[PDB]
């Protein structure tokens, strides 16, 4: 049982996450140009709201390197609801088992940061 290497993006708006081609891979100085590829997975948590009724919190979208997390078996570009793909120019379309997922017992999450020119899509924030 593991976690994303990075903190999540919170969807405060109403649009599903998407990044233009070449953008969206979180910065990780412990990874190489070939490794810069993966997917974000949506996770919507439910909570007992103020009025006693169950309700959805804002969705979170967590990054996983290609071939590693809850959808480790998916090839790049696979169509699946709640899954969107990202790849930096020059990345290799190969699984990243050498990066894998994070064990929270011995590694903090990396704060999700994107290169300077990239801005997060509308309604998206790295909290």
Author numbering: 48 to 174
Verbatim from the authors:
One central protein involved in the formation of regulatory ribonucleoprotein complexes (RNP) is the coronaviral structural protein nucleocapsid (N).
We further investigated the non-naturally occurring mutant Y109A, located in the primary RNA-binding interface, and described it as an RNA-binding deficient mutation. Interestingly, though widely used as a biological tool to mute NTD RNA-binding in a fl-N context, no structural characterization of this des_mutant existed. We determined KD values for des_mutant Y109A by MST and found that it binds Ext RNA around 25-fold weaker compared to WT. Considering a structure-based explanation, we solved the 1.93 Å crystal structure of Y109A and found that this des_mutation, similarly to the nat-mutants tested above, has no mentionable effect on the global NTD fold (RMSD 0.674 Å). Altogether and in line with previous studies, this study shows by high-resolution information that the tyrosine-to-alanine mutation directly interferes with RNA-binding, but not with the NTD fold integrity. Notably, while significantly reduced in affinity, the mutant still bound RNA via the primary RNA-binding interface. Yet, mutation of close-by residue R107 had a much stronger effect on RNA-binding, underlining that Y109A should be considered as RNA-binding impaired rather than RNA-binding incapable in future studies. A prominent example is the proclaimed loss of RNA-binding capability in Y109A that had been misinterpreted before, while we here–together with a recent study by Estelle et al.21–revise the effect of this mutant, facilitated by an atom-resolved view.
